[PDB]
Design a protein around this ligand. Structure first.
Ligand code: ATP
Ligand code: ATP
Ligand code: ADP
Ligand code: MG
Ligand code: MG
Ligand code: MG
Lengths: 242, 52, 241, 48, 295, 244, 253, 248, 163
């Protein structure tokens, strides 16, 4: 709604008499498919893609972040329609600082020049910004109120029947005899991310290749989901975030 | 291929001064893509080592 | 740093805790005690004032610890509270035991010992409170003291603690005369308090006052707190209001 | 702490200690080092 | 001392140039403002009347200031929580003064070398003189100015050096036909209150976020302008229920309502669409979830 | 962030928050059970999940509902060490009170004192918070059906009905729908059996998960007695619902 | 700020107009002044007034030196401070460095601190000199002494420290007098009122009320500035300070 | 800092960061206020429940310590109830053994305050999480009102507020307070001031309002002895509250 | 006599009375002055409700003649709220005048979308219904249609309300 329609047709918003909605905050847990979902919308339009970590511009060299965002937006203007994907705003998250060590103060600089750059000043034509982050809990108020922004999308853990659809995509790729045991599988696969479901297909197929069959059978899918569930909580702490 | 310490040709942190080891880091991705130049990665496999 | 506890000294053998505790006194308002031949006047300053604040139920920096010796208070008030009570109890312990009222020097000595004792042993905090003791005993007649938050005392004919200590001290001693009338003692207090204080209009509600006399009601040490309506008058004589 | 001088102090000091000792241990060219303290210099100089 | 042309082979002076080129740009975007509907004339006019008397008025008319015999004004400070329109107030006035608007940003002046940033700062004040009357604006002072001075690293001292340079020129030793520098911050805690200081920088205007129904009515008068909503849907029922909302929340409200119109494939916004908006992009409702032992 | 703070309970943050205490509101979901307590008009029911995940354990012993005293039940959500430990204090204060004052201790007074004791454990820094939610149920000898939930900080408030555990939000929503829709503050049955049945139904609705007698344990406080239903007693109830 | 006008005349003008008198009567010569106190007191403008009457060079050096590179570097323009001061003597140099750098680098040591340490320290060498004194009147300005670095602070290679006061009732009145002539003179005389009402915390407050009052008259479109204009004008500026500290009587010791 | 893990050492700038942070903790709490009259005291606070299922009807936030001395809080909810428990016991000790009945308002305030002082007096114990307002009546000093801070200091006031909306309530009270106010009139100021705190959730049943007024020999619990005075404290009911909010 | 005793709500009104006196003598330079005089001195805004309703009305009348009619409307609405939600003892008379004035400013802007918002059965055709309201809407529609002939018919019968 926010990105794809006004870029493709500005015209329908001219009729409604409002300005186009710009700005989305996407937040959720790692391996929840935030890159997937951001990438997906743009790819339809044919729009150019810019993936900039916000911790790869923080050096000890002060003003190193400022300089990099400056050129980044100006290139995007030529590569219109374009959506810049600001990956992590939790590495430049928060407002307080402006004191102590020079890294703390590097955050404010990055933030303060961006505010105008959103705001249209400057001027986002057929450029739109999609913001991705792990932590909306530590975010700047200036860069996270309304009117930076039109929809706050909370993306939880993949749904009870959302994981079922992820199993459909992955189980399509492989050669199999036809399997109908995902019903029990998805129930085993509670609290999992699409990254761990991805792993489960690959694992389920490694067992087939160890047993010397080129086919994914129901016996091996069951193994994948038990073993991943174990090794997921062993090296995890079951992290709590919004 | 056996690739030694990744604590110096592709640090996570950029609070290390690097400008050419920055470019080594970008080439480490290109290698993984090229192992799909035979399908999968079976023929040309990569092992890698890091100490942190 | 070596400010972690009282036990530990710096290279130079000073203790930072003592230093902080001195500075605590001057972050609460000016307090001035003047001794004169004909009485010792105490006057203090209100660090608080809100428009809905009341201060007519009590003086928050003046307590009588005995019927002959009273103290004006400078420092944090919670810290103050504990000690005001310890001193007054010790005073009457003397009265119970000897059937006469406590001499000034003992009373001060007791509280500086307790305060030092908190530095000398244990984990307990030092308690930064400076009391100006104004008393009468047959040893040296009127006597005006103050106690350090460093835990020792010094005799006086005038002393100022609380905010603007330097400012109060020179001004008081410039207009000091060895004799001094109790009316002039009052007049002086108000004049030095206005200059120090950043509230331009020194009103009676910014003032605490007592005058202590054995020259009034002879054979009897009599400490008398002025009421607001009396404080209100003297301000018009000094021409503030 | 940025740039433009990461090298200069490091080369310059080291190079000073070297040609003082390398003369020979002479008592005919004296040096005088005037300094605020040894806490603004390195903890070993060149070193008694 | 200024820029000049030398010929390439003679290596001798044959022509002269303005000093206005060979420096950094006078206006980062277009000289005339983008918004020509305005949301500054429509939106907080009251607050804007203060800003204009200091900024537009002395450059248009000298005669006005003369009459009292008072000299041109001191600097202007914009502060108040985000979503108060300070980025848009400053340029809405400037365009209608017919100044040409320095901005640049004070985030430019930061640099990774040494001694070059304070140089940029000195460069901007002279430059503003060369095209004066002009309205001088620095977009942030939230990082130029500080809570605590520091210099543990050299990189803290750089910040501190830019701070110094602002003030030193914002006396002016060669006067200004400009209004003195306009500045913007979010709060006054990232200002040194010692060093800004009336004198200097004297007009200080706090924009409210708490508002009154009059302040918010203006924001709607702007929205009624751009999309004149049906005579059936009531614009004024939305106002009465607002009690504590920013001009940025209001901006989103109208954005979200006419997004639901694109969805329904209409061409009008209705009072339903407003109520849907009224619920949402408000946040909170999460401080009751497990907490009740801090009440 | 962290700079001391969270390592202690006598250290406040800039915000005045005591962080370590908040960690016990995260430590009480560590058993993964969920509880439901509901009120009728002659009983309070309290129901918690029964996880017997290894058949190497005896399904009997498993429970977190403990009889504290004649008239008082309690459900524990969160850790087994802290379950027993809180039960010790509760059992003991209930007995001491009985003998001090000669008369039984109400749901509210047991709830009140447990919290204060916990508060003193937050005031001092040789103790720590017991990271459990305790939900006491009794039918009062003077105020009838009651539920008091005690939180690990030591807040206490009464309730009409309540839910606890990780999956609390869905149960909150169900229970809101129920009392709102009736416009009365209680379940309307005067047969305690159908209230236990009704409690069961709500619980299946809210969670989305059908149950078995190996996945429930049920406590029932009625006026002047308490009893925990055995597995075959629950079982009877489930076959009333499934075919009414 | 009368106290200050009298001092800076005795200290700066007398050794330059006649060096013979100061050496005959006293001994040595002062190396300069360290001006400190509240900001807003017009140290700089006062010092510019000194530079004009003595018939001395100016320059004024704004901030730390690194900034000029158009020929050479700013590290060596400190060395050239000597060469320039001497040839074009008689000079006054108003060397600036407010020291909002702070007390952090008064202790320090470490960081990029060594360059600005050098600029400040080597400047020091040229004045006192190793023979010859280039100029005797290089002049320091700063807000406090605790933020001032100790080589420079330590007297007897920099001389004289003069502290500006937050203005008296008397001072406020005299600052108020000179600008109000330029403005409009109130009928009934209410120039007396202003100084009674409040005493600023700096001399920038006294000037800032004057520019503000004639602002009030302007908006109404009236040439003269009344009693009334001054009454709003003192109030608006007082209100700013009062904001700051207000919760120091509720939830306080 | 390095004085804000310490419950012991002052700063060179005075006090503890821990007290200052305690004052913050107070300000996270709900808005409470009390207004003094010439024939009464009204006391008002708000109730939120964080679930409509919750029943904070049983909870009290305006709580009688003695029949002649009530109190409220702003700050941590558990810390209040214990500190109150101890207040009553210390109250029985200190003057219900001297006069054999409930203390003056002045006597109880300083003693309650003494309890706060002990949790600051000793390191390793944090101050109590709450600041109280204590209003009562005695005959030697009349109607009175107080704030008792966790610092161990206490202040007498005409009207005051504490809690989150404190700074707005404080200004309200200044103007609208008069040299003479009736009991009804403080009740009327109080409601308007509390409605600033929350709107769309404001009804007088979620608002707890009680008084310290005149003797009540109806809620005394005995009768036929006129040579005694009944409780100066009274809780007004939900309906009576509703009446005042209907009137406004 | 009482500038050395100014802090009263009494003399906020006295400054409002100058706006009225100077409004009628037909000079608005010195009404706008005394309007600011009342407002600054009415930073005691928790002093009585009536004072605050007069203050908004006076502001509106001036800005209405400043020819700012969106500003005119906002103060006018605010004056209205005061009367309607305050108790009635004379406030009924004042409420009616302000409803005409709301209509007055909006017709100048030549917007009939919002005039029609103001016309409703909850206070404009129910609690207050008056001949002067009907005069106003008759003018409004007449303005928009751009027929002076519709203006002419209206004014003859509604002159009383007008004047
Ligand atoms: N003067 C104004 N009053 C009301 N609303 C305004 C005004 N100017 C612009 N707006 C609306 O408010 C929105 C947000 O305001 P804007 O981004 O200009 O804020 P700011 O306070 O300068 O922000 P920041 O602190 O992020 O720099 C704009 O997108 C516009 O719709
Ligand atoms: N004594 C005075 N007589 C008249 N004007 C004064 C006086 N002192 C200060 N002012 C005025 O106050 C304003 C602020 O002073 P100025 O900026 O010159 O200060 P400074 O203390 O030298 O500053 P910095 O620390 O930024 O170097 C000026 O407008 C100046 O003209
Ligand atoms: N919801 C999902 N649907 C499909 N694949 C998923 C999903 N979520 C994650 N993945 C898989 O996990 C991998 C890594 O997750 P990524 O898309 O990089 O996430 P994030 O941006 O949340 O950190 C993806 O490349 C994809 O294989
Ligand atoms: Mg990603
Ligand atoms: Mg902005
Ligand atoms: Mg200066």
């Amino acid at each position: 709604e926010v990105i794809e329609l006004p870029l493709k047709n500005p015209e329908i918003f001219q009729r409604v008499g409002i300005k186009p909605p710009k700005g989305v905050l996407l937040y959720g847990p790692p391996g929840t498919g935030k890159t997937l979902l951001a990438k997906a919308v743009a790819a339809t339009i044919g729009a150019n893609f810019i993936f900039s970590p916000a911790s790869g511009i923080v050096d000890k060299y002060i003003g190193e972040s400022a300089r990099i965002i400056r050129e980044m937006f100006a290139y995007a203007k030529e590569h219109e329609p374009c959506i810049i994907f600001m990956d992590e705003v939790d590495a430049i998250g928060g407002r307080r600082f402006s004191e102590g060590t020079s890294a703390d103060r590097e955050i404010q600089r990055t933030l303060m020049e961006l505010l105008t750059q959103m705001d249209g000043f400057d001027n986002l034509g057929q450029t739109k910004i999609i913001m991705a982050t792990n932590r909306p809990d530590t975010l700047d108020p200036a860069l996270l109120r309304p009117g930076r922004l039109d929809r706050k999308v909370e993306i939880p853990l993949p749904n009870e029947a959302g994981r079922l659809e992820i199993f459909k995509i992955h189980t399509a790729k492989v050669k199999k005899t036809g399997e109908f045991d995902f019903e029990a599988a998805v129930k085993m696969s509670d609290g999992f991310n699409g990254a761990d479901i991805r792993n489960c297909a690959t694992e389920a197929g490694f067992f087939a290749i160890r047993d010397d069959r080129d086919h994914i059978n129901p016996d091996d899918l069951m193994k994948a989901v038990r073993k991943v569930a174990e090794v997921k909580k062993l090296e995890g702490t079951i992290e709590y975030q919004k | 291929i056996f690739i030694d310490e990744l604590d110096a040709i592709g640090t996570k942190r950029f609070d290390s001064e690097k400008s050419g080891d920055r470019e080594v880091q970008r080439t480490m991705l290109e290698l993984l893509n090229q192992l799909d130049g035979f399908s999968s990665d079976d023929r040309v496999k990569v092992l890698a080592a890091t100490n942190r | 740093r070596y400010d972690s506890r009282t036990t530990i000294f710096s290279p130079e053998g000073r203790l930072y805790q003592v230093e902080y505790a001195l500075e605590s006194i001057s972050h609460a308002g000016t307090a001035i005690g003047i001794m004169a031949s004909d009485g010792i006047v105490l006057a203090a300053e209100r660090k608080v004032t809100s428009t809905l604040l009341e201060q007519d139920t009590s003086t928050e920096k003046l307590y009588k610890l005995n019927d002959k010796i009273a103290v004006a208070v400078a420092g944090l008030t919670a810290d103050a509270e504990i000690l005001i009570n310890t001193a007054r109890i010790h005073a009457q312990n003397y009265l119970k035991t000897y059937n006469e009222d406590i001499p000034v020097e003992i009373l001060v000595r007791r509280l500086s010992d307790i305060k030092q004792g908190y530095t000398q042993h244990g984990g307990l905090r030092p308690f930064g409170v400076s009391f100006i003791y104004a008393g009468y005993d047959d040893r040296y007649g009127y006597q005006l003291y103050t106690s350090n938050p460093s835990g020792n005392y010094t005799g006086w004919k005038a002393i100022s603690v609380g905010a603007n200590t330097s400012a109060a001290q020179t001004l008081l001693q410039m207009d000091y005369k060895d004799d001094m009338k109790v009316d002039d003692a009052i007049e002086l207090a108000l004049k030095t308090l206005s200059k120090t204080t950043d509230s331009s209009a020194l009103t009676y509600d910014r003032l605490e006052f007592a005058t202590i006399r054995k020259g009034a009601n002879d054979g009897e040490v009599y400490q008398k707190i002025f009421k607001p309506q009396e404080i209100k008058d003297i301000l018009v004589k000094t021409g503030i209001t | 702490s940025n740039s433009g001088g990461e090298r200069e102090i490091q080369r310059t000091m080291l190079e000073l200690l070297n040609q003082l000792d390398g003369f020979d241990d002479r008592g005919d060219v004296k040096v005088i080092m005037a300094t605020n303290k040894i806490e603004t210099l390195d903890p070993a100089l060149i070193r008694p | 001392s200024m820029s000049v042309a030398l010929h390439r082979h003679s290596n001798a002076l044959v022509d002269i140039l303005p000093p206005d080129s060979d420096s950094s740009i006078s206006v980062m975007g277009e000289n005339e403002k983008p918004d020509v509907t305005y949301a500054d004339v429509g939106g907080l006019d009251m607050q804007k009347q203060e800003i204009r008397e200091a900024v537009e008025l002395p450059l248009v008319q000298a005669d006005l200031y003369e009459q009292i015999g008072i000299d041109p004004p001191r600097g202007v400070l914009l502060y108040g929580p985000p979503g108060t329109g300070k980025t848009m107030l400053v340029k809405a006035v400037a365009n209608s003064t017919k100044a040409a608007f320095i901005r640049v940003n004070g985030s430019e002046f930061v640099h990774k070398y040494l001694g070059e940033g304070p140089r940029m700062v000195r460069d901007v004040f002279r430059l503003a003189r060369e095209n004066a009357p002009s309205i001088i604006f620095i977009d942030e002072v939230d990082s130029i100015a500080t809570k605590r001075f520091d210099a543990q690293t050299g990189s803290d001292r750089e910040v501190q050096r830019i701070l110094i340079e602002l003030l030193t020129q914002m006396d002016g030793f060669d006067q200004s036909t400009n209004v003195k520098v306009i500045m913007a911050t979010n709060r006054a805690d990232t200002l040194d209150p010692a060093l800004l200081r009336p004198g200097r920088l004297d007009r200080k205007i706090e924009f409210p976020s708490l508002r009154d129904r009059r302040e918010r009515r203006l924001i709607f008068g702007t929205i009624a302008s751009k999309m004149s909503l049906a005579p059936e849907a009531d614009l004024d029922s939305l106002i009465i229920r607002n009690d504590s909302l920013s001009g940025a929340v209001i901006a989103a409200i109208m954005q979200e309502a006419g997004l639901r119109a694109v969805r329904k494939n209409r061409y009008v916004i209705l009072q339903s669409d407003l109520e849907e908006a009224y619920a949402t992009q408000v946040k909170t409702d999460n401080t009751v979830d497990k907490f009740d032992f801090y009440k | 962030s962290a700079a001391g703070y969270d390592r202690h309970i006598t250290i406040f943050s800039p915000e005045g928050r005591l962080y370590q205490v908040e960690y016990a509101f995260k430590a009480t979901n560590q058993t993964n059970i969920n509880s439901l307590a509901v009120r009728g008009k002659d009983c309070t029911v309290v129901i918690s999940q029964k996880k017997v995940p290894d058949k190497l354990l005896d399904p009997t012993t498993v429970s977190y509902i403990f009889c504290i005293s004649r008239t008082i039940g309690m459900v524990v959500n969160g850790p087994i060490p802290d379950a027993r430990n809180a039960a010790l204090r509760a059992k003991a204060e209930a007995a001491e009170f009985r003998y001090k004052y000669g008369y039984d201790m109400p749901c509210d007074v047991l709830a009140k004192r447990m919290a204060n004791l916990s508060q003193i454990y937050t005031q001092r820094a040789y103790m720590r918070p017991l990271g459990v939610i305790l939900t006491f149920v009794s039918v009062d000898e003077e105020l009838g059906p009651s539920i008091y939930k005690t939180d690990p900080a030591g807040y206490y408030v009464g309730y009409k009905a309540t839910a606890t555990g990780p999956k609390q939000q869905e149960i909150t929503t169900n229970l809101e729908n129920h009392f709102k829709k009736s416009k009365i503050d209680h379940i309307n049955e005067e047969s305690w059996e159908k209230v236990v049945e009704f409690a069961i139904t709500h619980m299946i609705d809210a969670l989305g998960t059908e149950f078995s007698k190996n996945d429930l344990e049920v406590g029932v406080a009625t006026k002047d007695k308490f009893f925990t239903l055995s597995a075959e007693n629950i079982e009877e109830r489930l076959v009333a619902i499934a075919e009414q | 700020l009368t106290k200050q006008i009298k001092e800076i005349k005795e200290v700066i003008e007398l050794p330059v107009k006649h060096p013979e008198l100061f050496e005959s009567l006293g001994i040595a010569q002062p190396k300069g002044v360290i001006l400190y106190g509240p900001p807003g007191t017009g140290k700089t403008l006062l010092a510019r007034a000194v530079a004009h009457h003595t018939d001395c060079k100016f320059i004024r050096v704004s901030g730390a030196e690194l900034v000029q590179k158009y020929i050479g570097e700013g590290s060596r323009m400190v060395r050239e401070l000597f060469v320039m001061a001497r040839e074009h003597a008689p000079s006054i140099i108003f060397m600036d460095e407010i020291d909002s750098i702070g007390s952090t680098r008064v202790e320090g040591s470490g960081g990029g601190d060594s360059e600005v340490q050098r600029t400040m320290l080597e400047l020091l060498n040229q004045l006192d000199g190793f023979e010859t004194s280039k100029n005797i009147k290089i002049i320091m300005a700063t807000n406090r002494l605790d933020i001032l670095d100790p080589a420079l602070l330590r007297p007897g290679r920099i001389d004289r420290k003069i502290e500006f006061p937050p203005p008296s009732v008397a001072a406020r009145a005299e600052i108020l007098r000179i600008h109000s002539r330029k403005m409009n003179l109130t009928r009934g005389i209410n120039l007396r009122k202003v100084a009674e009402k409040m005493n600023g915390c700096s001399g920038a407050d006294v000037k800032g009320v004057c520019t503000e009052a004639g602002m009030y008259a302007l908006r109404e479109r009236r040439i003269h500035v009344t009693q009334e204009d001054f009454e709003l004008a003192v109030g608006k500026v007082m209100n700013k300070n009062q904001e700051t500290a207000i919760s120091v009587a509720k939830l306080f010791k | 800092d390095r004085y804000s893990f310490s419950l012991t050492t002052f700063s060179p700038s005075g006090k503890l960061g821990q007290i200052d942070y305690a004052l913050t903790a107070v300000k996270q709490g709900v808005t409470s206020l009390g207004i003094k009259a010439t024939n009464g005291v009204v006391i008002a606070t708000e109730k939120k429940s964080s679930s409509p299922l919750a029943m904070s009807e049983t909870l009290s936030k305006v709580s009688l310590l003695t029949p002649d001395i009530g109190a409220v809080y702003s700050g941590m909810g558990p810390d209040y109830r214990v500190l109150v428990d101890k207040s009553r016991k210390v109250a029985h000790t200190s003057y219900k053994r001297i006069y054999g009945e409930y203390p003056p308002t002045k006597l109880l305030v300083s003693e309650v305050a003494k309890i706060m002082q002990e949790a600051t007096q000793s390191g390793g114990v944090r101050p109590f999480g709450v600041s109280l307002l204590i209003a009562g009546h005695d005959e030697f000093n009349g109607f009175s009102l107080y704030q008792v801070d966790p610092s161990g200091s206490y202040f007498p006031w005409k009207a005051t507020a504490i809690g989150k909306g404190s700074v707005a309530a404080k200004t309200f009270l200044e103007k609208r307070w008069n040299d003479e106010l009736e009991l009804e009139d403080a009740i009327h100021i109080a409601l308007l001031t509390l409605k600033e705190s929350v709107e769309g959730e404001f009804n007088g049943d979620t608002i707890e309002l009680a008084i310290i007024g005149d003797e009540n020999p109806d809620l005394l619990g005995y009768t036929g002895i006129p040579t005694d005075k009944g409780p100066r404290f009274r809780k007004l009911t939900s309906q009576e509250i509703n009446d005042r909010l209907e009137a406004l | 006599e009482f500038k050395k005793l100014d802090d009263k709500p009494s003399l906020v009104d006295v400054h409002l009375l100058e706006s009225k006196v100077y409004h009628k003598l037909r000079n608005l330079a010195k009404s706008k002055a005394s309007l600011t005089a009342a407002r600054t001195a009415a930073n005691s805004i928790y002093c009585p409700t009536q004072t605050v309703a007069e203050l908004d009305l006076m502001s509106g009348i001036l800005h209405c003649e400043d020819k700012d009619y969106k500003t005119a409307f906002s103060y006018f609405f605010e004056s209205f709220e005061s009367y309607h939600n305050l108790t009635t003892h004379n406030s009924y008379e004042k409420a009616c005048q302000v409803l005409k004035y709301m209509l007055l400013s909006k017709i100048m802007l030549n917007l009939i979308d919002d005039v029609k918002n103001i016309l409703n059965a909850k206070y404009t055709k129910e609690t207050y219904q008056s001949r002067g309201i009907d005069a106003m809407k008759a003018v409004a529609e007449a303005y928009n249609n751009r027929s002076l002939l519709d203006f002419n018919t209206a004014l003859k019968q509604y002159e009383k309300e007008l004047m």
